[PDB]
Amino acid sequence: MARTFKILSPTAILGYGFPEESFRKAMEASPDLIAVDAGSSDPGPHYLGAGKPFTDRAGVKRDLRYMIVAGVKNNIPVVIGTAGGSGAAPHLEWCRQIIHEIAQEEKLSFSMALIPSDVDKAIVHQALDNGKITALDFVPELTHEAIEESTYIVAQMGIEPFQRALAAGAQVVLGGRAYDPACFAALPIMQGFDEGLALHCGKILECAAIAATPGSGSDCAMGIIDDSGFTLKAFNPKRKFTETSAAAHTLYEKSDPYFLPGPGGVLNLKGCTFKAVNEGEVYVSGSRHEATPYALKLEGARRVGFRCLTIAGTRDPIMIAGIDNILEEVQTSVARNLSLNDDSIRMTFHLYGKNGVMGNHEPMKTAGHELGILLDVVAPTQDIANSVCSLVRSTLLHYGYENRIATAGNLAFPFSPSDIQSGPVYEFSIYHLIEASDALRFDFHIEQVTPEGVQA
Amino acid sequence: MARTFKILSPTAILGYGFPEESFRKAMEASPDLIAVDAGSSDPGPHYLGAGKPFTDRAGVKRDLRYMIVAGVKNNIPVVIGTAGGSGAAPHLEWCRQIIHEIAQEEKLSFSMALIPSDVDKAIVHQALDNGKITALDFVPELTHEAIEESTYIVAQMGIEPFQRALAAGAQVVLGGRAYDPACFAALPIMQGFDEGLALHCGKILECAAIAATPGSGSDCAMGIIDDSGFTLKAFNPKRKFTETSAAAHTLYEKSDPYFLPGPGGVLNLKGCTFKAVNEGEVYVSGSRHEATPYALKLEGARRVGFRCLTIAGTRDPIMIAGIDNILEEVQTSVARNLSLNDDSIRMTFHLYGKNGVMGNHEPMKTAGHELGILLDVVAPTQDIANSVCSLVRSTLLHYGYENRIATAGNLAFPFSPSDIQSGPVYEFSIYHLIEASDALRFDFHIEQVTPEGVQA
Amino acid sequence: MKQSLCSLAQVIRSKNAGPYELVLDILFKTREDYQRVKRSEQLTPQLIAGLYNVKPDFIHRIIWFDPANAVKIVMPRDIISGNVGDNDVYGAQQHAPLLSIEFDF
Amino acid sequence: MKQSLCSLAQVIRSKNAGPYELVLDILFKTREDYQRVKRSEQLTPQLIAGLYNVKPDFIHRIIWFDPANAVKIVMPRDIISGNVGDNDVYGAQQHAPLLSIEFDF
Ligand SMILES: Nc1ncnc2c1ncn2[C@@H]1O[C@H](COP(=O)(O)OP(=O)(O)NP(=O)(O)O)[C@@H](O)[C@H]1O
Ligand SMILES: Nc1ncnc2c1ncn2[C@@H]1O[C@H](COP(=O)(O)OP(=O)(O)NP(=O)(O)O)[C@@H](O)[C@H]1O
Ligand SMILES: C[C@](O)(CC(=O)O)C(=O)O
Ligand SMILES: C[C@](O)(CC(=O)O)C(=O)O
Ligand SMILES: O=C(O)CC[C@H](O)C(=O)O
Ligand SMILES: O=C(O)CC[C@H](O)C(=O)O
Ligand SMILES: [Cl-]
Ligand SMILES: [Mg+2]
Ligand SMILES: [Mg+2]
Ligand SMILES: [Mg+2]
Ligand SMILES: [Mg+2]
Ligand SMILES: [Mg+2]
Ligand SMILES: [Mg+2]
Questions:
Q1: How far is B209 from B231, CA to CA, in rounded Å?
Q2: Record's InterPro entries (chains A, B) (predicted)?
């Protein structure tokens, strides 16, 4: 019937790593829960759409080895949200296999719950027709065509599926796509700790030491929930929590810091306080949670084309000064030479050193002494992308721009080959709320992991 | 010989393209030969090493369609050197297949000679032991291990293999790796035009309108050889040949403009003059050739690892000012997290906007307002490269550098996914002369190309 | 003399808020500084829009978050994260125009 | 009287001469100007070496090609074309230090 609940978040995204000494010091604090976020939409739609991880298998395995060994040894649950980077079926399976390998190598046995977040297209089609879909801010209205042309569709689960898995005795809970705070908050809430404090603590812990200062995406943090607030601490003498660092992480990646919405309710933070306590720790209080009619956020992406790219520098001041017109003239030349006639062939330039990061919103209008010219072509087939990219590359290389004096070639390529096929390109196609229903219930199942695998 | 010999060079490298109108105008001048270079070592060792073209199949096919239709229609030979970009067996076959398709689509029948340039490793090993190999300037001495670990090995042929194929009636001559001037000079020399003038003409024409001004890698040029010199012209009113443009092309890509070595001799240009004639044309005279003991240049490459890369910009002035130290700290962090202890992992950064093009030779020591950060890792396996690249990317993304104020992330990625697996990396391993021998003779084979394929 | 935003702020940054929105966060060094800026009424949509080369109506919200002495500027992403043509998939390096801000107080 | 190279040169450029060598070509608009530069003896290995951050002995040759009113500077590539770590595989954008040259006539 303990009056505190201690949560260890080892790293901002499972796979990003952390210092072994930080993790060891955190375990000396005897957490009640080891929890981590394993995924995000911020790396863009490729990862969900193609079924691929944005994290590295060796890094995820390295990080999980510490976590699972520690949780099993000390009888501390380990809870993971958005398995495998994006939390669809292939991502969940990818992370599951890593865990089996750890159990074989470390000679461990433990129960593991798997909670898939995949949503069949038929459910989404039916919900659209029944008026149960709502676009988030600035998102286009959903159509049947967008649903059908998406690949994996996932819903961000809340606390309740994790709670059911934990109540069934799972020692490791491997969740598919999940609302990042829920990973952290599910267990303390079911043990009676305050929902507002637990979800706000989870929102500050979901990126581990990004909420500390100096920040790190690869260092540990702990939150300790008590009856009146929660305390945040790091485990690296070079890092600490401050009122600013903790409050900044309350704003992080949110549209409105007063109201953080998620499945089942909204965190209302107008009463929050941040107080520096002890040495390098912060006590947070006043967070409130308000229930709302239950809805889930769906994510999906669709393939839009295929990309080929090239990168090269220029050091010539005449070429740099005239670069915008040069690129237009090269494009015109290539279209004429290859008789291009498809507006779906899209050539994009990034001029690093002038406006590569901000594009038309860049305030500085002049380059310095060097540009990095990144070109990419997205086209309906890989062959077309490759062909247009190649001709842009060779045309730009030898283009006779006005007043040119460096007449043997215009580009410094760092690599052989100069052109790189990068493959299918995805765009987000679903970013919409769906009203909860029986059909959308998240089921878990528990498997008994052993050093020999899972039996039968 | 008598009066003149007109050579049309349509483009700097077969596949780079050219304006249809320029080609039409050039044909109205009634060339005696359509010749083109199809390859180069300048794009680096990947293309020979991996057996791949640096040019685009669709571009090559487009350019050859104009050339072969015109040559066959008007009974003008078409001669191509360094087929397929690098001129080894796979490159030659790739270009051969393109030509078969053109004959099928345009309903053409013609004889085509193929001249391979591949050299068996056994020949090179034997030559090394027999003292018949000479390194070119600054090239390391050749070893048996370097020979054995090379992939495709090719020799640059001279004029004589082309001449034997033409004498046998070939209407299209598709040469493997070749000395660039030779595919232009072979025919006029066999017709009695002076060897020195014809080879110098070929050297000036080998990149078509790169030798004109404003230059283009994608526009036509003609040389008209007479018994006292040669005249150079373009076929685009916006381009001209001038004394400077033609003389510049005599210097182009050579280490001594007075003496240009190739298979069978050296062009001596001590006595040459360049003189403007007509309107936008140049007359070149005085070139001469000195025979030398016959030797061939060999090229080869070897695989050195696998690459994974990422590109992202930064717009923050504190990050930019501190970037060199930040990158070192990120490397140290990744090596500790992944327990890296292979000196065969190589991490390279290019900081576009500071010193991406010139490296340690860049005179400017300060960046401007933006950097393009290109990272590449080369390692013994793709998996290792991918893992290191991924961890460097995520560590750099969230690295808490001193005085940071932009604390939600450090990098602007243009793409999803952020990491690009570029695959095998090659380096040059052979760049050496070999004494000619019977085993190194370049033999032609003629096939009859028809609208339904090759007919015997 | 004017007071630069950099002299008053500990954090000046951008990030996505999902794929469709860009948020700019400014956390002030002291509550007094935050209140001075808020009272001045100088951190306006017109100011931000001019700095970013957008129309003032493109700024969706400016949120004064008193518990953190922080202000959040919210605008739509004019390129959805990861769309063809994007410059900054994570929205992480769009803060630089704010570094030019100076207050007349 | 200081006179810039850029005011005299029609061409100032770099390129590979094979994978192991970098060549810099300077071609003058007039024979008069070429000869003035040549006879001045001011375009030395030491000048070029300083501009490129190399030792003077790294410059292999400076060749005065009278028929083209051109001078060619030859040096080894300190990174073989296409080797891991390269910056410019074709050797095409290494000319910029020459743009600072001023003669004294
Ligand atoms: N049920 C819901 N109702 C409303 N909005 C929701 C709901 N579920 C998710 N969202 C929205 O989606 C966001 C999900 O945030 P989070 O779970 O932190 O995502 P993430 O992509 O995994 N982030 P991170 O890994 O930190 O980069 C919330 O901030 C809301 O804007
Ligand atoms: N037999 C030979 N003896 C000496 N040097 C040779 C010989 N053959 C080739 N070379 C050298 O190799 C170079 C080949 O030049 P070239 O044929 O123009 O090559 P390339 O790589 O096809 N050029 P490009 O297509 O214009 O980029 C010559 O300049 C010489 O330096
Ligand atoms: C992908 C991620 O690293 C996740 C996070 O917010 O921690 C990012 O969005 O920057
Ligand atoms: C590959 C190429 O385009 C060939 C040429 O010299 O024309 C180059 O070396 O720049
Ligand atoms: O809308 C804006 O002002 C900028 C968002 C932009 O789309 C981005 O690529 O980050
Ligand atoms: O050797 C030099 O001075 C510079 C050559 C450099 O290696 C390159 O990458 O072009
Ligand atoms: Cl005031
Ligand atoms: Mg997440
Ligand atoms: Mg994020
Ligand atoms: Mg999150
Ligand atoms: Mg060539
Ligand atoms: Mg070349
Ligand atoms: Mg050549």
A1: 14
A2: AtuA_N
